RNA sequence: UAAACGAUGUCGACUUGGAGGUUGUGCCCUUGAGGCGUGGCUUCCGGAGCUAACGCGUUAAGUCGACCGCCUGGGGAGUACGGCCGCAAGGUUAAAACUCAAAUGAAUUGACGGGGGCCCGCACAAGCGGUGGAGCAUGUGGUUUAAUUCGAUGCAACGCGAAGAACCUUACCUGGUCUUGACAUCCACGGAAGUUUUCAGAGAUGAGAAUGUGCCUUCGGGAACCGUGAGACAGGUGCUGCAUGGCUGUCGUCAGCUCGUGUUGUGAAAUGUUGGGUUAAGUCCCGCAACGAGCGCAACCCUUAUCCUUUGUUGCCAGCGGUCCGGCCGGGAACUCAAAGGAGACUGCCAGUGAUAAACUGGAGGAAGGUGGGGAUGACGUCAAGUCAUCAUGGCCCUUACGACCAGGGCUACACACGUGCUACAAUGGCGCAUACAAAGAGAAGCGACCUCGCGAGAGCAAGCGGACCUCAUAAAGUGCGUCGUAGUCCGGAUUGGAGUCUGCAACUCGACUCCAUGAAGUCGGAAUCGCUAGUAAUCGUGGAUCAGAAUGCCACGGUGAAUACGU
């Protein structure tokens, strides 16, 4: 029954909660749906939507789905090495290189999602849909446009990426 | 429901004993068929004026453990609602559900 | 509806007979629930027919029970377009029971001095094709024999069937395509 | 919210009850009120310990109480004075010479009403009731029973409006009519008003209760197979 | 003008194809709008890549190019306003104060189609009978008074909470009468309570007589019943059912619902839990992301049916005795017979049907075949569904009272309508005479043989009883014969005069039963409308729950005991 990935650190970021209705066909039951984010400290594509009778059983379901069919991904230093504009499904987010002298600057549940992602110093404005369910894809799409450091000279910088497989 | 009829019934059993005991068949002895050529006259037809509340004909009981507006059941000392309630919890003995 | 087909049950015999045509005649002659009178009502009727002619006791009974007796019935069905009918062939068991029912309603209002005279005269009257349910048998069979030219919602059913595998003819159907 | 009649219409048809006595005629009413009274007043006196089932019984010339507990000898006291006092009041209420024995039920350390005590505390103190019913069912299924149903109602969590919620697990049939299965209805108040739990617990479908008797009583234990019967 | 469009500006370069429509042309057996070679517009299908979704995908909505057009929330507005063109209405780009927290692209599931199609409950049908019409029983409203108390309003109210209603009951209304109070504990005073007995007043309540002064003890003093009084406190059909707990009705025997968990989508959420075939069934063959398990359902269960089996009375009697030929009793065990172990029958077999198949129907022996007959038996749960009035209960009000003692009046009035059921309108029945067999159960303040009384019901006394012992009980319809013709009769027997009875001082309105004479409504009832598959339906009596007193009902029993189930 599946392989799972782990981090040596705890994430229990509950982002949303909902309830399921059929309203006449068996009427309406007490069930909830839930969305929970499991990072790594440097990032994961870990996002899980699950559902059950009660809120606790529901979140723990959703926390399980945030670590199966998912793998961890990694980025050196608290910044991102590319000024790129991550888009995922109308929720569009921005990054530009920065200092360590600034840490996070963000609010709500977003400051908690960016800390595990490693893209919190580079944190620039979000636009399009910025309600909780889709705003939180920073650590997914913003780590699939990824750049990360491996060179010793800027003029060997494109040469060094070519010889990584040649 | 409602305590005043339950209050009436509780007073009544000591008042049955006091008024009615000495005046049970006395109606019959002094007036009706037992008064065969004896009694039937005014000088004895004043003797029964105390019992009226004490009479078995006002001894309606209702639910012996709470009170209830009609629908009493004499074999349990209980009622419709209160029987079902006691049966849910298995407090009543010998109790089948009908199947034959 | 109905999850399954369900047939008739066993019916018990009566203390004066072992023949079925007699036991089924006393049964739908039963009213107030009391068959033990109806036993006599059947046998007292049959003796009066038998005095009218002595060849049999069954003379007028057997052809009345053919002649007032249907063969086909018509239901009315429509869920769109225009109004239609669907004829069905029915079981002997119900053909017979309409006929016996109609004989015992007609005879009990016939108003003669014995239930024995009333039934022998009402079977004598329908046997010769001039009693009271000859009209009812003739009208009901005419309507079922006639509405065989129609089918449930014909106008959309004629395209609907040939698209979903079916015939190009004109046929009656049980509340579906044709 | 139809709430099918959860146990009353299910008894005496190989399903034991919390009374076993014989009465008939017009005095059945005088024996039942007396049996309610002794049920109410006796368990209040042995309330020092928790208690799992109650059985009061009236055979020829005696009154016999069976009681079931999570540990034995505990309602019986020390010395023997404590239990002679339990027999004093059983005679006083029923009006017959008294007996009591101590016995335990199948799966003793678990019972219907001790789950509802556990769920009630959080609600009484107006804090931590959103995982409490679920943790109650988890503990309950770790201590025994083949299935449990819990339904909680109240002005729950101290709310200014009412809520129904429930929690069901394992195998708890509802048309069942064989083996005793243990039921409690709590009722209690706190500052905001009334709370309540309906606790059905299910031990076994042939485990626990009586079984159907496997013989007639007519051939057995009879040292002389006649009185006369014409054979002498 | 416009939905005036590769819906996608103009035109072009580049990016896995295959095929449709249909066409230049090379090649083919020209082998059917075809294939291959190489172009064509034009369309299906889907990969790299793209979208919020539909969808796009070599004709892009991909990768892009140059260069131009246009948008900055909605409504109000494609209008106003300005420039211009137009016989002439008009057209054209294109706005705000004001109003307002939205408006708007897409999609899930419920419901829903009157778009297409599929399924089920005695829900119809196939019938049969019943309410609705008469009259009565009983509840509802209308309407009425001091008041004729509510709760409930198709299916989800009306023989139901609130099953036995003179007062009591009991909410309602009026009259007396008191406030620790009918009831518990705690203090104070008078009477013991209990019983017998005269009387006043309405009865509450009190006075007097006669019997008794018990109970515990500091004989201080109190409990018990009753009166008196004070607090704490008892009590509250006290309000609020969007403040609640407990509890239950509905869909429906729908044939599905849910618990844990994975997966597909960004997700809401689905999937399973949906299809076909089959079923009481998540039962069973086939099968897709559903897997594992529970619920409904199946089961254990009590009961019946023959039949085995044991007991042998308060049960039975083939032969036998006492003998009027009755198990009453000497006696007998073949036998039912009662309550219980159960046996037997499993859709298991065979055949048809059915997609192979679950399973349905037929077939047969047998007491009995459709998961043998009967009953148990009903999911999660919306419905602000209904009870604060069994009962629990806060917020929160009275506590000389939204408590409590006592009498009388009323729901059950009567105008009618309405729910339900009862028994008639016939003759399958009624009558007259003669004639037959039950099952089950209720009786410890009770009923009850005999008794004397009684038109009958019943009456008071009492052996007796514990109900297979004794009694309700003559069980009736049915059966035998004769009789009756749609005439309110040969059906029905309401009203009313008048007598006799029950629980109780006390039966007048509000109560129940017996019986004598006369005698009406009612000809199978319209709109409406339901229950039922076989011990049912119909119909007749019986007992019981209830139960102070009494039934037309209900509940269960036994007599006599039906049509049919094609079809949706």
PDB file of C-alpha atoms (C1' of nucleotides) in Angstrom, chain D residues 1-6 9-10 13-14 24-27 149 153-155 161-162 164 166-168 170-175 177-178 183 185 187 189 191-196 198 205-206 212-216 218-219 222 225-232, chain E residues 242-252 257-260 293-302 309-313 330-333 339-342 375-385 391-395 442-446 467 547:
ATOM      1  CA  UNK D   1     -34.305  11.398  11.932  1.00  0.00           C
ATOM      2  CA  UNK D   2     -36.588   8.488  12.231  1.00  0.00           C
ATOM      3  CA  UNK D   3     -34.931   6.777  15.314  1.00  0.00           C
ATOM      4  CA  UNK D   4     -36.189   3.206  15.135  1.00  0.00           C
ATOM      5  CA  UNK D   5     -37.142   1.834  18.544  1.00  0.00           C
ATOM      6  CA  UNK D   6     -33.611   0.651  19.390  1.00  0.00           C
ATOM      7  CA  UNK D   9     -39.369  -4.386  20.606  1.00  0.00           C
ATOM      8  CA  UNK D  10     -36.429  -6.873  20.601  1.00  0.00           C
ATOM      9  CA  UNK D  13     -37.150 -13.780  22.322  1.00  0.00           C
ATOM     10  CA  UNK D  14     -33.679 -15.148  23.352  1.00  0.00           C
ATOM     11  CA  UNK D  24     -49.432 -12.090  36.706  1.00  0.00           C
ATOM     12  CA  UNK D  25     -52.957 -11.109  37.604  1.00  0.00           C
ATOM     13  CA  UNK D  26     -53.627  -7.633  39.182  1.00  0.00           C
ATOM     14  CA  UNK D  27     -50.470  -7.454  41.632  1.00  0.00           C
ATOM     15  CA  UNK D 149     -22.573   3.433  17.916  1.00  0.00           C
ATOM     16  CA  UNK D 153     -26.669  15.955  21.170  1.00  0.00           C
ATOM     17  CA  UNK D 154     -26.879  19.076  23.211  1.00  0.00           C
ATOM     18  CA  UNK D 155     -26.212  22.898  22.819  1.00  0.00           C
ATOM     19  CA  UNK D 161     -27.429  26.766  18.883  1.00  0.00           C
ATOM     20  CA  UNK D 162     -28.167  22.959  18.868  1.00  0.00           C
ATOM     21  CA  UNK D 164     -26.771  16.512  16.214  1.00  0.00           C
ATOM     22  CA  UNK D 166     -22.695  10.744  15.720  1.00  0.00           C
ATOM     23  CA  UNK D 167     -19.884   8.249  15.330  1.00  0.00           C
ATOM     24  CA  UNK D 168     -20.251   4.508  14.295  1.00  0.00           C
ATOM     25  CA  UNK D 170     -17.470  -2.079  13.242  1.00  0.00           C
ATOM     26  CA  UNK D 171     -20.431  -4.484  13.340  1.00  0.00           C
ATOM     27  CA  UNK D 172     -23.634  -3.113  15.135  1.00  0.00           C
ATOM     28  CA  UNK D 173     -26.805  -4.611  13.495  1.00  0.00           C
ATOM     29  CA  UNK D 174     -30.026  -2.795  14.092  1.00  0.00           C
ATOM     30  CA  UNK D 175     -32.834  -5.450  13.291  1.00  0.00           C
ATOM     31  CA  UNK D 177     -33.160  -9.862  18.185  1.00  0.00           C
ATOM     32  CA  UNK D 178     -30.659 -12.581  19.615  1.00  0.00           C
ATOM     33  CA  UNK D 183     -27.570   0.369  25.961  1.00  0.00           C
ATOM     34  CA  UNK D 185     -29.277   7.075  27.583  1.00  0.00           C
ATOM     35  CA  UNK D 187     -29.336  12.960  30.537  1.00  0.00           C
ATOM     36  CA  UNK D 189     -27.321  19.748  32.616  1.00  0.00           C
ATOM     37  CA  UNK D 191     -24.335  26.198  32.834  1.00  0.00           C
ATOM     38  CA  UNK D 192     -25.674  26.668  29.193  1.00  0.00           C
ATOM     39  CA  UNK D 193     -28.424  23.952  29.563  1.00  0.00           C
ATOM     40  CA  UNK D 194     -28.897  20.183  28.827  1.00  0.00           C
ATOM     41  CA  UNK D 195     -26.479  17.709  27.031  1.00  0.00           C
ATOM     42  CA  UNK D 196     -27.020  13.968  26.147  1.00  0.00           C
ATOM     43  CA  UNK D 198     -27.210   7.774  23.268  1.00  0.00           C
ATOM     44  CA  UNK D 205     -24.549 -11.958  18.088  1.00  0.00           C
ATOM     45  CA  UNK D 206     -24.478 -15.284  20.024  1.00  0.00           C
ATOM     46  CA  UNK D 212     -32.152 -21.160  23.451  1.00  0.00           C
ATOM     47  CA  UNK D 213     -32.737 -24.203  25.662  1.00  0.00           C
ATOM     48  CA  UNK D 214     -31.669 -27.371  23.834  1.00  0.00           C
ATOM     49  CA  UNK D 215     -34.296 -29.930  25.297  1.00  0.00           C
ATOM     50  CA  UNK D 216     -37.822 -30.245  26.528  1.00  0.00           C
ATOM     51  CA  UNK D 218     -40.594 -33.034  30.012  1.00  0.00           C
ATOM     52  CA  UNK D 219     -38.265 -36.257  29.694  1.00  0.00           C
ATOM     53  CA  UNK D 222     -37.584 -38.035  35.961  1.00  0.00           C
ATOM     54  CA  UNK D 225     -41.671 -42.461  33.934  1.00  0.00           C
ATOM     55  CA  UNK D 226     -45.289 -42.828  35.235  1.00  0.00           C
ATOM     56  CA  UNK D 227     -47.874 -42.166  37.859  1.00  0.00           C
ATOM     57  CA  UNK D 228     -50.012 -44.909  36.358  1.00  0.00           C
ATOM     58  CA  UNK D 229     -50.649 -44.164  32.589  1.00  0.00           C
ATOM     59  CA  UNK D 230     -52.767 -47.375  32.431  1.00  0.00           C
ATOM     60  CA  UNK D 231     -49.501 -49.498  32.398  1.00  0.00           C
ATOM     61  CA  UNK D 232     -50.202 -50.811  36.035  1.00  0.00           C
TER      62      UNK D 232
ATOM     63  C1'   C E 242     -34.115  29.002  15.651  1.00  0.00           C
ATOM     64  C1'   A E 243     -32.247  27.533  23.595  1.00  0.00           C
ATOM     65  C1'   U E 244     -32.510  22.600  24.414  1.00  0.00           C
ATOM     66  C1'   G E 245     -32.271  16.718  26.213  1.00  0.00           C
ATOM     67  C1'   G E 246     -34.825  12.141  25.889  1.00  0.00           C
ATOM     68  C1'   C E 247     -38.254  10.228  22.103  1.00  0.00           C
ATOM     69  C1'   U E 248     -40.556   9.353  17.288  1.00  0.00           C
ATOM     70  C1'   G E 249     -43.249  10.079  12.054  1.00  0.00           C
ATOM     71  C1'   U E 250     -42.102  10.453   6.692  1.00  0.00           C
ATOM     72  C1'   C E 251     -40.087   8.857   2.231  1.00  0.00           C
ATOM     73  C1'   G E 252     -39.805   2.542   1.544  1.00  0.00           C
ATOM     74  C1'   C E 257     -26.975   4.380   2.403  1.00  0.00           C
ATOM     75  C1'   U E 258     -22.484   4.775   5.032  1.00  0.00           C
ATOM     76  C1'   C E 259     -17.375   3.796   7.708  1.00  0.00           C
ATOM     77  C1'   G E 260     -11.815   3.428   6.724  1.00  0.00           C
ATOM     78  C1'   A E 293     -15.904  -3.650   5.964  1.00  0.00           C
ATOM     79  C1'   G E 294     -20.606  -2.553   8.257  1.00  0.00           C
ATOM     80  C1'   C E 295     -25.961  -0.970   7.662  1.00  0.00           C
ATOM     81  C1'   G E 296     -30.696  -1.916   4.965  1.00  0.00           C
ATOM     82  C1'   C E 297     -31.652  -7.203   3.397  1.00  0.00           C
ATOM     83  C1'   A E 298     -30.110 -12.539   4.590  1.00  0.00           C
ATOM     84  C1'   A E 299     -29.274 -15.207   9.813  1.00  0.00           C
ATOM     85  C1'   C E 300     -29.710 -16.752  14.596  1.00  0.00           C
ATOM     86  C1'   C E 301     -35.458 -16.039  16.849  1.00  0.00           C
ATOM     87  C1'   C E 302     -40.473 -17.417  18.571  1.00  0.00           C
ATOM     88  C1'   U E 309     -40.442 -37.136  20.212  1.00  0.00           C
ATOM     89  C1'   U E 310     -41.400 -37.062  25.892  1.00  0.00           C
ATOM     90  C1'   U E 311     -45.002 -35.862  29.952  1.00  0.00           C
ATOM     91  C1'   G E 312     -50.023 -38.511  31.309  1.00  0.00           C
ATOM     92  C1'   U E 313     -53.307 -33.685  34.584  1.00  0.00           C
ATOM     93  C1'   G E 330     -62.493 -48.896  38.565  1.00  0.00           C
ATOM     94  C1'   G E 331     -59.302 -48.933  34.549  1.00  0.00           C
ATOM     95  C1'   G E 332     -56.575 -48.605  29.487  1.00  0.00           C
ATOM     96  C1'   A E 333     -51.991 -45.674  26.271  1.00  0.00           C
ATOM     97  C1'   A E 339     -45.263 -26.872  25.236  1.00  0.00           C
ATOM     98  C1'   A E 340     -41.466 -27.835  23.772  1.00  0.00           C
ATOM     99  C1'   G E 341     -36.642 -30.591  21.454  1.00  0.00           C
ATOM    100  C1'   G E 342     -37.267 -30.230  17.117  1.00  0.00           C
ATOM    101  C1'   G E 375     -44.381 -13.230  12.365  1.00  0.00           C
ATOM    102  C1'   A E 376     -40.034 -10.717  13.678  1.00  0.00           C
ATOM    103  C1'   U E 377     -38.361  -7.618  10.462  1.00  0.00           C
ATOM    104  C1'   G E 378     -36.834  -0.962   7.713  1.00  0.00           C
ATOM    105  C1'   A E 379     -30.061   1.966   6.581  1.00  0.00           C
ATOM    106  C1'   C E 380     -26.979   7.383   6.779  1.00  0.00           C
ATOM    107  C1'   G E 381     -30.562  11.386   7.148  1.00  0.00           C
ATOM    108  C1'   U E 382     -32.366  16.512   5.191  1.00  0.00           C
ATOM    109  C1'   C E 383     -37.561  17.639   6.614  1.00  0.00           C
ATOM    110  C1'   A E 384     -36.170  24.295  11.628  1.00  0.00           C
ATOM    111  C1'   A E 385     -41.243  17.927  10.857  1.00  0.00           C
ATOM    112  C1'   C E 391     -40.166  12.688  31.575  1.00  0.00           C
ATOM    113  C1'   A E 392     -35.329  15.858  31.547  1.00  0.00           C
ATOM    114  C1'   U E 393     -33.998  20.976  31.619  1.00  0.00           C
ATOM    115  C1'   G E 394     -31.269  26.214  31.500  1.00  0.00           C
ATOM    116  C1'   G E 395     -32.109  31.247  30.526  1.00  0.00           C
ATOM    117  C1'   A E 442     -59.740 -12.969  32.371  1.00  0.00           C
ATOM    118  C1'   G E 443     -61.033 -13.166  37.611  1.00  0.00           C
ATOM    119  C1'   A E 444     -56.587 -12.388  45.642  1.00  0.00           C
ATOM    120  C1'   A E 445     -60.477  -4.946  47.916  1.00  0.00           C
ATOM    121  C1'   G E 446     -62.082  -9.775  42.750  1.00  0.00           C
ATOM    122  C1'   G E 467     -58.198 -20.922  35.876  1.00  0.00           C
ATOM    123  C1'   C E 547     -60.955  -1.720  33.499  1.00  0.00           C
TER     124        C E 547
END
